[PDB]
Design a protein around this nucleic acid. Structure first.
Length: 74
RNA sequence: GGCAGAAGCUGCCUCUUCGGAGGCAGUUUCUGCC
């Protein structure tokens, strides 16, 4: 089961399996004449997730909902 | 003695091609390493 959000729990699992921490990247290759958005990509060992936001502390939190379903914590 | 990771609730700033973008804190909780 769980006792935390998909974000704090994900960060906490990496420390319990004698690993370190996740790794995160900014994409934002977008450039449409009437649409823009933040776009984030994270990696946890052999798999990745994506999310969007309005700053570097708000895109990271939206991808978290997928970060368990990508490596086997669904 | 020193180092590392994340968020619940609440609050703030700057830019805007008028699509929207860029950025933070306060308060409270959990975890790892030498």
């Amino acid at each position: 089961g769980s006792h935390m959000n998909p974000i704090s729990r994900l960060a906490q699992i990496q420390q319990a399996k004698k690993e370190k921490e996740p790794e995160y990247t900014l994409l934002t290759e977008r450039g449409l004449p009437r649409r823009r958005e933040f776009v984030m990509q994270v990696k946890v060992g052999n798999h990745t997730a994506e999310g969007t936001g309005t700053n570097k502390k708000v895109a990271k939190r939206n991808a978290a909902e997928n970060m368990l379903e990508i490596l086997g914590f669904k």
